[PDB]
Each structure stands twice: as structure tokens, then as C-alpha cells.
């Protein structure tokens with residue numbers, strides 16, 4: 001099993017655009033904003049449960065800065081095809097700062113062992129797929145100054 005995650009962050013129901021992120025006003029940041037993330041997954045094991053942890057990180061100069069602003073973990077089930085979409089809802093996120101940018105990272109970890117890593121034909125490790133791209137605009141929230 002070898003899969004891929006793609007992510008698209010959403011704020012106030014606005015999806016980050018492929019080349020544009022999603023913008024929030026300084027006042028909205030101060031009030032708190034509802035953040036969600038849609039994970040497009042492929043090559044997961046059909047019908048299997050995955051523990052998905054998402055983090056929102058401050059990003060500057062192409063790196064995450066400090067500990068995540070928020071983290072959320074929940075369980076999802078993979079579609080019958082092993083490909084599909086899951087939506088993580090972070091709730092209202094506070095403390096995003098004017099003029100700063102934030103990025104969503106996601107990691108999916110199968111509840112069951114599904115990967116043979118030593119070659120004895122027995123599954124010994126979870127399938128783990130992750131999307132942790134600090135420069136991915138589709139995962140990026142930008143707060144106006």
C-alpha cells in the first residue's frame with residue numbers, strides 16, 4: 001500500500017485557490033475563524049480506518065514557525081475504492097496574526113498494520129501518508145495586515 005494525500009484548506013467556507021490560498025481580514029483573525037481542510041486521498045486500503053492528525057502552523061520563509069497553532073485528530077474510513085475525500089473541521093481558530101501566513105499539514109495513519117517493511121509477507125507497520133508542504137498555497141491561510 002502506497003498512497004498520496006492532497007489538502008485544500010477552507011476558511012469561512014472559502015476554499016484556498018490553487019495559486020492564491022485563502023485570505024482573511026485582520027478583524028476576522030481577531031474574532032476567530034472557522035478552519036476546515038479537505039483531504040483528497042488515493043491508494044489507501046479500501047474500507048480501512050485511518051487516524052488523521054491535522055496541524056495549522058505559522059509559516060515564514062518557507063518553514064513552519066514554532067508549535068502548531070491548533071492540532072486536531074479524528075478517525076476516518078477509506079472509501080471502497082481506496083480513494084476519496086475526508087473533511088477535517090478544526091472549529092474556530094483564535095490568535096492568527098495580521099500579516100502572517102499559516103499552512104495545514106495532514107498525516108493519515110492506518111489503525112491496523114497494513115504494510116510489510118521487512119519482507120516476510122506479514123503487515124508490521126501502519127500505512128502512513130502525509131502532506132506537509134509549507135509552500136503549498138492550497139493549504140495556506142493568509143491574514144491581511
Ligand SMILES: [Ca+2]
Nearest residue numbers: 116117122124
Ligand atoms: Ca513484515
